Symmetry: D2
Subunit: 499 residues, 4 copies
């Protein structure tokens, strides 16, 4: 009796008992006598502007679509909650970490990157794992990928990068030259490239993948002590990837594979879950790290900085209306309540700006006012007013300037940001040469096995092959620098593909 998903309407008509259906109305609420036959003059005459029943619906029709996400356009979402299982208060005075058994409702949206709205899940691309913590101190957004690292470490190259992985400005077709001309000129991607073309390249569904905040963040206890951290939410359904083969099969067989896997899962009562951990680094150690603790192209070896469990990320309800609750979702890295703060991680810094920016454009100035985005477990009160599509009462007739002598909202000094010290010139400091191989080399011949080491080298060559020859070399060169073998294997492969 198909799957829970396919029976979407099925279950709807049922649960809708036997009570009559609501009356079809116009946006205004005026009942429609007949919305199947246009208002015409004669059985074969023209249409009347007077058929506002028509205009009303058609009008709305022509405006349903809104701009898709610049990146991560294709994804799925579900709601659930978080719960504490450990006490890290000695680490961060965040309200969500209150005490054990302390729950918080969440929202999540998995997704790919380069692919548009029509794209299919089952394909090589990093994955999006975003969590919205509707806390008491406002919503907390831990926007993270399925990997602890990224290709670039300076926000200034992301626009270019994304462009590189997307379409040709002219042909509107994917383009290897673009893809690899960028990667080749910027070896800093070496680390993440290797992760993309590794088995992890294509997770089997969203449920069998690990979550990562990626960036280095900052924790601060109710005592004013701050320490750098890294979030890790590992899957409790075990890691499971998809063969280049299956992936491509599913790709066209069920483009929305990863999509319904999630739905049915939650429907068949088999709710997904991830275990939230966090690494820790004192400012002392941070000054010692063999690298930049804020370099997005690096990791904190688990041996030197072990994961501390903190909580359970459980999803148990699926969106009722996809658009409203998922397509419309807004995740802002800048959304961090008292206890959690960003690090000087140049990429994070940029994200502090881009997300709310794009949201205002994709969704609208008052998008945080959208049900799904509104921090309902907090009391939003301030001196911001109006704006297009202003919902709510817009804070009634309350004094709209600060300061004021009329009892309008005051600032809670107990939430002040954490004071740090920086000494140096304001300049554009070149981070293009901050070691792009070390951690990579120990990933090729260390994290991976000879078995999957060959699968990786294959996956890569199967794409790099399509790039101009002048591109192919410069590329191998990099892989070469990570390890002559990790570069020779790939090359060999190319020579064969290359005929």
């Amino acid at each position: 009796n198909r799957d829970p998903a396919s029976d979407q309407m099925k279950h709807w008509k049922e649960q809708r008992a036997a009570q009559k259906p609501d009356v079809l109305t116009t946006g205004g609420g005026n009942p429609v006598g007949d919305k199947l036959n246009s208002l015409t003059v004669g059985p074969r005459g023209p249409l009347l502007v007077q058929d506002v029943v028509f205009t009303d619906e058609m009008a709305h029709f022509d405006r349903e679509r809104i701009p898709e996400r610049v990146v991560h356009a294709k994804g799925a979402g579900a709601f659930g909650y978080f719960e504490v299982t450990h006490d890290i208060t000695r680490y961060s005075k965040a309200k969500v970490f209150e005490h054990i058994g302390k729950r918080t409702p969440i929202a999540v949206r998995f997704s790919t990157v380069a692919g548009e709205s029509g794209s299919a899940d089952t394909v090589r691309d990093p994955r999006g794992f975003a969590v919205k913590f509707y806390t008491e101190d406002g919503n907390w957004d831990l926007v993270g990928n399925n990997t602890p690292i990224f290709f670039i470490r300076d926000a200034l190259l992301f626009p270019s990068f994304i462009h590189s992985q997307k379409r040709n400005p002219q042909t509107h077709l994917k383009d290897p030259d673009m893809v690899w001309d960028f990667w080749s000129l910027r070896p800093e991607s070496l680390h993440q490239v290797s992760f993309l073309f590794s088995d992890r390249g294509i997770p089997d569904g969203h449920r069998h993948m690990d979550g990562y905040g990626s960036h280095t963040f900052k924790l601060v206890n109710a005592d004013g002590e701050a320490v750098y951290c890294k979030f890790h939410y590992k899957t409790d359904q075990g890691i499971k990837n998809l063969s280049v083969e299956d992936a491509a099969r599913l790709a066209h067989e069920d483009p929305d594979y990863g999509l319904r896997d999630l739905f049915n899962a939650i429907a068949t009562g088999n709710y997904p879950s991830w275990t939230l951990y966090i690494q820790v680094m004192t400012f002392s150690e941070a000054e010692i790290f063999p690298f930049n603790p804020f370099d997005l192209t690096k990791v904190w070896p688990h041996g030197d900085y072990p994961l501390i469990p903190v909580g359970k990320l459980v999803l148990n309800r699926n969106p009722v209306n996809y658009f409203a609750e998922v397509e419309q979702l807004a995740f802002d890295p800048s959304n961090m309540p008292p206890g959690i703060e960003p690090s000087p991680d140049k990429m994070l810094q940029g994200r502090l700006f881009a997300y709310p920016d794009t949201h205002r454009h994709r969704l609208g100035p008052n998008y945080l006012q959208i049900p799904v985005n509104c921090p309902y477990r907090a009391r939003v009160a301030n001196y911001q007013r109006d704006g297009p599509m202003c919902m709510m009462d817009n804070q009634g007739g309350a004094p709209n300037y600060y300061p004021n002598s009329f009892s309008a909202p005051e600032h809670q000094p107990s939430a002040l940001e954490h004071r740090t010290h920086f000494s140096g010139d304001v300049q554009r400091f070149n981070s293009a040469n901050d070691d792009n191989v070390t951690q990579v080399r120990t990933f090729y011949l260390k994290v991976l096995n000879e078995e999957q080491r060959k699968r990786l080298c294959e996956n890569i060559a199967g794409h790099l092959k399509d790039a101009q020859l002048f591109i192919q070399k410069k590329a191998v060169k990099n892989f070469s620098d990570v390890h002559p073998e990790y570069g020779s294997r790939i090359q060999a492969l190319l020579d064969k593909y290359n005929e």
Copy 2:
């Protein structure tokens, strides 16, 4: 102390009581630690991207403004109720007239016409009197002026009319050449131009003027019998207008005179009111009527068509937040509940398209979702989805197609349009010379008395005198047609004015 309007905050803080100032949060609901000083590297250093309290706030301010209404930009609003005092049901079956005593929540917006957001209330100009009935059959928006007639009878000339009435495309100044060159070329305006330059051209506040639906409408009863009608809502505060010197004074002394007079009255249990009447006419009568019964430049003489009392219009509530409840208010003449239907009035016909059309651009595709515009009395159920800034549930997961087989919203034969028959060549009929003198002639001699006729001519001459001689000629000519004396009197003044 001072007036209620001026005591806005005072009263707010008192009612607020001894409570504690809500915690000042970002749009995201995060507490602010100090919204008075920016995050900088040093006491005299750069501003950091890291300051999201600033940007969260700043970015909203930058997006505070929405386009003002292209016309009737300046205005004041108030909510109240509509009470049925009679049984008119013998004509219209709208559930808004159902049973005597039946109260229907209403919203009202008064306004001028030409002036933009910052203009003054005390200037000569028609006046807007929009009434929104939140009925159980959706919303009823009766968008009427304080005059029963208008300057033109074909929408095709409205865009141009409003242009001539506003600013010159290059100097951005008021243009008497645009104003009069247009009016002169369209004598059909003579009627309303008369009513305009008369003592009624500037009413003393909104509480002292009448409200007219202007257009001819339609009423369909339970049996399905229809009738043409006109709406009339006379003022219970009595017709009181302002003099050129006093209106001209208040222009600078208090540009928001109307907005204030209205706030204060209501704030002191001094609720304004209007009795609602209607002129009922038969298709057979509309057949006999000597003039085009749908021509916007004509009136239905009280004599032959006496007014029938319907109910009362009380405004007993003031807007809490002006932007959210007034600025965003949107009345669409097409929102007529079952029982009320439009008429062939060319003018009205065009308005059926414009209001929601422009509302989509001024407010947004989902404007009908704004609390003030939402038909909170009736239940909105249909097959329209998505659209930017989608509030509520987007009808959750109910079927989006129609018809369907899963118990989704159904038709309503009862609420069907009343069918009328028309015959003729579908073409653009020149309605330019449908007599633009007869009714003005009566207004000039029978409606006005000598002292009023005196003013009407000085008021005209005082503004017309700035247009070029040739326009003045053409202009006067049209006046003599209504009446020899009308022309000569104005002409007389012009020669004087032309020193």
Copy 3:
């Protein structure tokens, strides 16, 4: 060496040689010193708002996306010209057909339907074939499809139809319950559904494939005599379709298959072309003719109304910048120069509003000001002003109200529309029953050969086999209502799929 599309950048550079690369600047033209390293205080310090180079690029990137077309998102486009080869002057006075040899620049975008921007080119779904003629009497948009009929005959059914073919409101996946449920309760779709599931369902590229004006139109000659007609532009590369499996693999092998094909063809000098034909029907015949001549689910048979030759459609130019020239492309069926006029088609009429309406939403109010949409081979002069993103000079200091005595644009009586007579009550006429089978049966037998007839039934069952039985019944019922074996054959197929 590789295909022309792949070598896009390669050539762009090659030809750009002998030239120094332009200086990288900001949106404002200020040269940037370094666009790879953000501005921070100290090498490991926070990002400074100061870095305006950053915000400029990021803010713009954060807004690259505009809403995709509500339908026909996945498409491709090219440019060419139209050449008059034959004289149909006695039918249309339209300057486009003026003389033999008359060249008129054109632009075209082909597309699929339901699938979103990321979808693949080769799938069962009709194909949009819109043609924009930049004529001296303004642009003429012939928004056609690769089929001469459509699933429905009343605009009111469209928003609902489209929803069925799209995603589920809650599970966001494609849904056969909606697809069929709709098609079941709506049999008039039979004609098109058959054609669709036919071999033509997956044309090769956008070349080989035919284009049809689809709707019935009206032609007017220099003597006011009007006649009805159907537009036809047959491929010069002969109808060639894709196999189910073939197209099924290309689906993931190369989703942009069309894009590639069309680009490379043109790029290599292999410019495709089409021959335009017209079927003419006189008002007399339109009267006698034996189902509604304006029904969109019906077709005129070359039998009685033989195809007449008019001219050639040649595409010899590729888009330089895709987004700018194809994505932003807007076609309005309502754009018809003198000689061409709408027809009572309930379906058409509706299109007369949706298109510009949605364009103002998706592209913006001044969309006709975007280069490729501008009627550049004409002289747009009128009384329209302002609007957002207003380009040009807003028509400069020209008078902006009509009429006027200042030499502003005067209208042309010549361009007056042809008048027709339409008698009959103005109401909602039921058309759900206008024969949704006759012609359909003639396709299954006469047109379709035992060969295609086999794959048609097979293709239908292959899809329909996923919907509840109660639907399958209704679906087979209508088919057998066309011809016993039609559904009979389907039914057999259906039962095997249901294990």
Copy 4:
């Protein structure tokens, strides 16, 4: 014959002697038959959607309005040129100062601050004076006011400030409590408040007022040597302001007095001009300066930092279409070319963000492409693409990723920002007490004479008298802090006013 502005259309008609009126067309370029009569039913029948000429025009009319500037909405603009007259090449290497005689086009917009578009010109209020220099190195926007200081010093107070300066959230009226409750609590304003209420508060048009950069900026020469500065461009027409008397008369007799004046002056060859001087403070002196050198509520005494002639700002060309060339006009302080950078001024810092941020909303993502805003004197080349209302060729088929090996634009190292060192903890430093009286006292006692102090206190007390008693206390208290005599005089006046 009237003022040159009155005859706008006259000279336009005259302008095209001869020349025949262009043909009235739709937005698509289709010629119009009858633009005065809609297409109806019969002479008294309904309207047909089939009428596109109407809908084309109406839909546009319905979207003419865009959000008015959040502040400084009511203004006037003009174009002219900038001419170098002194070699200041030892301080700035900017090309706009490249060499004596060199002329650069400029665009200027004058403005009030609080009133919306309908507001009156002649009212006490600072005055906006923005200059746009279309320099070879991109556009340089010097966004100055008519005062060298400002009320607040930290951007976070700005939204608040402006709010208190506008209408009441509930009553929508100007709130004296709002105005003085805010000023009373933030004494840093005293300086501006005093300047504001002096004879300089209501200038006589835009031609008789000085223009000031206000903020301190950083000039950078060819040797990479930096220096701080302040821009001053004094009227050549002489500082002339209006009296509280005439100003109130003009407020109703001519709400557009400034608009009209500027136009006419230019129209009659009487071009206004301004001599541009600059002040120079070396990094050393900025160290021992008695006040914070980047504090907006302070000035650099001519005595120690003498003005230096640079060149002349001349305006000799009126806008042809106010909207297209003035209303749409946009200035960004961020637009600074090589040799002209920002200071750490907390206020200037927040501005680098807000202008482009707001322009992207008021005008749209691609507002830099609007003619008036485009840097048409430089070659904009970069890796930015798409966005709505994308004009030009969107950089065509150029490589869209940086870096790339395909000859796309490259960064110019000689346009890098001058590196400055800053050291301190990153925190929210409190500048609320950075001396808010010294300079004020000098203005009161030295800059003004008795006659003046008298008018000032009268002007201050005039408004203040309306605020609640407790607010008057606080305010007078602050004035006494500047000078015992200062507060007393105001207090005496208050004592009076209050009966």
